[PDB]
Give the backbone structure.
Amino acid sequence: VDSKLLPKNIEPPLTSQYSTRHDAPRGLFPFESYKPSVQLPDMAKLKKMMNTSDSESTLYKYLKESKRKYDEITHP
Amino acid sequence: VDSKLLPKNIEPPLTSQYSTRHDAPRGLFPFESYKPSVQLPDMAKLKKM
Amino acid sequence: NECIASTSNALKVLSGDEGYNEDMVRRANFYKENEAMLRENIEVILSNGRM
Amino acid sequence: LSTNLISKISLLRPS
Amino acid sequence: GYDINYISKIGEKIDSNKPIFLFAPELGAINLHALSMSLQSKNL
Amino acid sequence: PGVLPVGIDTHTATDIYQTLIALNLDTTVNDCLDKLLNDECTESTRENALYDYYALQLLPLQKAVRGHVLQFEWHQNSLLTNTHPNFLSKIRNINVQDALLTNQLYKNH
Amino acid sequence: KRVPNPNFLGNCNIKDFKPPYI
Amino acid sequence: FSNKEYISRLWHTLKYYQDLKNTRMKSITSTSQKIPSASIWGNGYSGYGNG
Amino acid sequence: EIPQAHEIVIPSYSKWFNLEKIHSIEVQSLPEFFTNRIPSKTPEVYMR
């Protein structure tokens, strides 16, 4: 019935719309961003434990046969 | 007798399809930091190595 | 199993972190067994205009 | 820029 | 595997400076009628 | 320590789990992209891979909205006696005025 | 010079708060 | 994920909340000097019915 | 039909209020319309 106007907000930083950073701590928001561990035996373990891909496998056997014919034709 | 020619009530018309905003108190919503990254992470270096 | 589940939880409180278990809320059956509170909270956040 | 890809680029992302 | 005395020493300050809820000086004009009607709202 | 056995390092066991999840996700994204890009694949599995690509590019947005609703849901249940068990409310030691009021109550009856 | 009240179509005091992902 | 990273995470979390408490104190001293500043939480009500 | 020409604000604890529906708070606050003792106080009269 008798409405009033909020005058003006002198906003301090981090109290604002779009005042959020990737560097901020996720206290809540339980989903995490995890550090990729680049270790060479763990690289071999990741190469072994990855399942497959069909075009990758066919192009692997294609490139392997092409490299085999390459090393067998560059010798004589 | 055709409908809408039947006698109807003299009333204020319907305000059912009106959009309302809400006065929520001060401590209702939490403080939110850490903008989430919508973009998918890229693994070009891992598959390159 | 109670010695492990009350050791990592004993580290989460002492570190100061909080929240849900990350590996529990990552699946889809969590949001199907908690179908009741999500229809409340989605309407509360949408009607206040924060969604 | 090839027309095999121009028909699919706006398909995969409508923006 | 950690030195949890130092971890707890820092986590005490983290829990102290964590934004859990409002303090007494920053509550604003507390309206008793709004509280009394929100308690009957059977929300959570 | 030599007579003691060696142990599985958990801090690297988690990392090659999340990283394997991300690698399988990237391989599935690059696999559902190729199924629509060629023209020899049938239209019953050319549009289905398109919506499977849509659902896979929409994953961290789903994580953002899912995290947001769950953060608000967790804020619903912070009650200042869970997080603050050492809350000091109020107390009052017994004054002489209490005993005087009691004696007045027994005198005026 | 007119001045709009807070009960005006489009002149509310409750501003639309944006989510962090947007 | 080792100790030397898990404590450096906690140093890059406490220093955030100390600046957050500095902001919280400045937004209290602003309104105590009769200047209507916004807080960490939103502004509560408007002139509608409640004050 | 009249288009919306004003800003409408109800408080947040009145989120449950929806037209063409009777909430439990309306029953527990005004019970005389829902105890079928007087035929001139029906929930249709209350909704009207």
About this structure: Helices of chain E lie at 4-16, 32-38. Chains E and D do not touch (no CB pair under 8 Å).
